[PDB]
C-alpha cells in the first residue's frame, strides 16, 4: 500500500519502467497478483499542498 499521482499508476506493472517502477517499487517479470488503484484527491490532498 502506497500513494502516487495518477500519471504514475500505469508504471506499477510487471515489465514496466519509469521513476516509481525504477526507484520506489518494482514488480517481478513473473508477477502473479492484482494492482488496484483509486483516486484519493479528497483524502490525500491539502490546501497549500500535502
Amino acid at each position: 500500500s502506497f500513494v502516487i499521482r495518477g500519471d504514475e499508476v500505469r508504471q506499477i506493472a510487471p515489465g514496466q519502467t519509469g521513476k516509481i517502477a525504477d526507484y520506489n517499487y518494482k514488480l517481478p517479470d513473473d508477477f502473479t497478483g492484482c494492482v488496484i488503484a483509486w483516486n484519493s484527491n479528497n483524502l490525500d490532498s491539502k490546501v497549500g499542498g500535502n
Binding site: P14, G15, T17, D29
Partner: protein, 50 residues
C-alpha cells in the same frame, strides 16, 4: 566418375552441415537473426518474444 557412390556420401554430409550452419542467418519472423542485436534493441519482455 566410377567412385561416384563414395563421393556422393561425402557430398551429402557436407551439404547437410552447410545447410544447418546457413540456417543460423534466418530470422524465422524475428526483428533480426543476430541474438545480441535483439537484446540491444529491445526491452526484456519484448526481446523474449523475438
Amino acid at each position: 566418375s566410377a567412385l561416384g557412390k563414395l563421393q556422393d556420401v561425402v557430398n551429402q554430409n557436407a551439404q547437410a552441415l552447410n545447410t544447418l550452419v546457413k540456417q543460423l542467418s534466418s530470422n524465422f519472423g524475428a526483428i533480426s537473426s543476430v541474438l545480441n542485436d535483439i537484446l540491444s534493441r529491445l526491452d526484456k519482455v519484448e526481446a523474449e518474444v523475438q
